[model samples]
Target: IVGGYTCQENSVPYQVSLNSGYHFCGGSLINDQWVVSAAHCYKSRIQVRLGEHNINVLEGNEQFVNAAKIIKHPNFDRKTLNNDIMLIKLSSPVKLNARVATVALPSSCAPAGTQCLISGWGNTLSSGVNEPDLLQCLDAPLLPQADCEASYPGKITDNMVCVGFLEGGKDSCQGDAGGPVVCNGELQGIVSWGYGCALPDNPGVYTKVCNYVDWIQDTIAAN
Candidate 1:
């Protein structure tokens, strides 16, 4: 993400590296063997590297796995970025360890002004494309829906939430899609899309995780 510092190693154990030849996007391990990401990040043959902090080098704690199947939200609208969430099943369950774990899903939407985190290996451009060797993270504030609506106008929807600064500076940039927005240590949102990296009055948007908690569980049960 733009304007962020390198994250502490093993801090975000659930963070997943969405690889398609290379790191295409980031994801979150929501269950023992289920990964959640944005629908737009769908890859026919997607690979995921779990418990990874530094992408430049391979670590012992890291587990590389394949996606057995991907299930995107049936109501996802690519153009509007609504229902932009997806759940991916692992080929097999992983053996959990210190560096590998699952994130807890939020019980409800985090109220406005809550502090949250957004982490990824996306383009480090806020200060152009200096690819970070380690996972980058930024502490973001979840703004009020009304304020965000002012910035994006009718673009905002119930299934999405706005993040970052309106004055511009911090945001989830390119290659950060499908990443997690952790609030109170619970997975709350999914990095979806933005007009640009960090633009004035055009903050980064994410898929509201809490809005789909029931749907997520139902889908998992059916599977």
Candidate 2:
């Protein structure tokens, strides 16, 4: 449902809004103190909003956490968006509750055609529409690397992923960068970049989370 409505508040409790003053991107809470997001989504001022659904009003479930540090992948390339991943450390560990939790990391890569879910407060249209008050959830299909390479041609790297429809629509748009892409009920990818929102032969691109599991573990452990 990349082109769908509001998601149930507590359904995806691990989801967090990486707010740069305002809600600018989305992220996945990996633990009480760590969040995974897109390196390209980094900004000078970022805050973590937990358990939030409606972006317009302050919901009772919301918990704001200040970002203490942002660790972008050393080789992250913003030009082509290679290694477009990062880890965010909360200023203080969050207190886990019913409406706030962490998403499980994947042990393996999901095959193509897998049904996946993406959530964000990004634009409904390409870049012309207003953002929604509620978090939007979309069900999309993961495209094989071959097919994805065909679409982007010399762009899709092994460190990245692609998901969405070729016929257009049902794709993540602007402001969705760094949002979680859940496949098989586990955290799989992070929204990286795209040609535009919902374009034929132009599926939305994502950061392959499976490729950096070890780095994430090491980063957290070392810090």
Candidate 3:
């Protein structure tokens, strides 16, 4: 994440690394066994690592588990990048602790200009390099629908929300997708896509989690 800071250990307990030998994507732990991520991060044999502060080092608080199931949104559009959310069911429920717990889902949609916190183990630069072992956090504001649409004409949809600056400098980058976009300490958006890493006039787009609250609740209940 460009223009970000290294997040304190255990400060972002819900953030997890979607690993396959190496960290690839970020996700949020919604429950003991369910994690919310972007459909684009979906792949077979993914392992979830919780309580991970420094990914390259083994912290005793970490909990690693295999994915029992992966449920990508049925209407996910790879081309349009719409409905890009997904859920991963863990093979076993994790024991909750100070360094490992679920994050609350948004109770309502975040409005434009709402200040939010986004954390991930993504590229620290726009060049797509310098992925840090420690988690990074960036504070940004949600953009108005009209402003966001103007930035990416014919691309922004109802299911997506934009967050970042119009003049560039700060944003979630590659390896940060599928991570959490939190406002008021609640999971509001899932990092989905963008034109590039922190480019001017182009804010990072995310899957609006408020739109899928019912779906997530129902899916968890049914399973």
Output the lDDT of residue 211, model 1: 92
User: For each candidate, C-alpha RMSD in Å?
Assistant: 1.1, 1.3, 0.8
Q: TM per model?
A: 0.97, 0.96, 0.98
Per-residue CA lDDT of model 3 for 58-164, tens digit only, reads 86889999999999988999899899999999999999999998899998998999999999999999865797888999999999999999999999899999999
- Tell me the lDDT of model 1 at 192: 92
TM-score, cand. 1 vs. native: 0.97
lDDT of 2 at 141: 81
TM-score-wise, the better of 1 and 2 is 1
Instruction: Give lDDT: candidate 3, residue 95.
Output: 94
lDDT of candidate 3 at residue 166, scale 0 to 100:
91
Residue 118 lDDT in candidate 1: 96
**Which is the better candidate, 1 or 3, if ranked by TM-score?**
3
Q: What 10-residue stretch in candidate 2 is worst by lDDT?
A: 1-10
- List model 2 lDDT by residue over 13-119, tens digit each: 88898876688889999999999999988886789999888876976878888999899999998698999999999999988988898888998998899999998
lDDT of each: 0.90, 0.87, 0.93
Q: What TM-score number comes out for model 3? A: 0.98
